[PDB]
């Protein structure tokens, strides 16, 4: 059975696995530790980008607003922002970089624009997400210490919210579409959820990773002949320097989407 397969995967893996699959054909779910908290790491970037998209619904100039990039802004992982030092990036470009490259500078610019991690949390609450919490900026939001509630959510909460954001009620249509375009264009997820799915399926995703071998991915999946699936796979380990384990996420994806 799918629960037995997940249990065994977890057992073998040396960690703690959290899975929430929502099948939008019938709102059925596959849940494994889905009400337990995990450090989100960069999966939290979706909430900050979406909060900016929500603002853009009532401000037509916002996404083209230029933001200065200073060498001072750079932190530990800045693939896109480092190319624009001494220049500017628009808020749309910052959303794109945060989601498609997991740029940490870009996420900090989003957070600062919004008025701090608390504001990201309030945006999640406005969507009916009672679980999400953003407490820190980049890079410290990825410390992923076992039992630390900062910068955490549950698999089910994040699957529900990702569904609302990408397929449902959270954003007006142009902004929903923009979020989906960004997720589909992610460059960091090939060995995660995507690797456990049929090649022909269309996928948008956002990865996350941190200490304690914390290895995460959240995805919206469009099968060729079926309604979409929303899948959250979170994974963490007991030792601070554990290797990250994207293969576990791919394996979980295969287990829960194999029965199609
Ligand atoms: C103190 O901050 N520590 C981080 C960290 O910055 N995590 C963030 C996060 O999630 N990111 C993702 C991410 O989305 O997974 C990638 C991934 O980018 C790519 C190209 O794969 C790059 S690191 C950034 C970290 C990461 S691993 C570890 N021990 N710590």
Curated annotation (Swiss-Prot):
Q: Which UniProt keywords apply?
A: Antibiotic resistance, Hydrolase, Plasmid, Signal
The answer to keyword Transcription regulation applying to this record is no
What's the domain of life for this entry? Bacteria
Spell out the Pfam families in the cross-references: Beta-lactamase2
Q: What class of enzyme is it?
A: hydrolase
Q: What is its EC number?
A: 3.5.2.6
Single GO molecular function: beta-lactamase activity
Function, as annotated = Has strong cefotaxime-hydrolyzing activity.
Stated family = Belongs to the class-A beta-lactamase family.
Q: How does it assemble?
A: Monomer.
Q: Which NCBIfam families match?
A: bla_class_A, blaCTX-M
What is the name of the protein in this document?
Beta-lactamase Toho-1
Origin organism is: Escherichia coli
């Amino acid at each position: 059975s799918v629960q037995q397969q997940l249990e065994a995967l977890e057992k073998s893996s040396g960690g703690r696995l959290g899975v929430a699959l929502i099948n939008t054909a019938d709102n059925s779910q596959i849940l494994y530790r889905a009400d337990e908290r995990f450090a989100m790491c960069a999966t939290s970037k979706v909430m900050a980008a979406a909060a900016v998209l929500k603002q853009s619904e009532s401000d037509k100039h916002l996404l083209n607003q230029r933001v200065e990039i200073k060498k001072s802004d750079l932190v530990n992982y800045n693939p896109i922002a480092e190319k624009h030092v001494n220049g500017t990036m628009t808020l749309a470009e910052l959303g794109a970089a945060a989601l498609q490259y997991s740029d940490n500078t870009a996420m900090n610019k989003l957070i600062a624009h919004l008025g701090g991690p608390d504001k990201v949390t309030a945006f999640a609450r406005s969507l009916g997400d009672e679980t999400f919490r953003l407490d820190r900026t980049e890079p410290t939001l990825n410390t992923a210490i076992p039992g630390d509630p900062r910068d955490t959510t549950t698999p089910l909460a994040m699957a529900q919210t990702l569904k609302n954001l990408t397929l449902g009620k959270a954003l007006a249509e142009t902004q929903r579409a923009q979020l989906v375009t960004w997720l589909k264009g992610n460059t960091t997820g090939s060995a995660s959820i995507r690797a456990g799915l049929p090649k022909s399926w269309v996928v948008g995703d956002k990865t996350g990773s941190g200490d304690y071998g914390t290895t995460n991915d959240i995805a919206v999946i469009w099968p060729e002949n079926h309604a979409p699936l929303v899948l959250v796979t979170y994974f963490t380990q007991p030792e601070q320097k554990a290797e990250n384990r994207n293969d576990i996420l791919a394996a979980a994806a295969k287990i829960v989407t194999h029965g199609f």
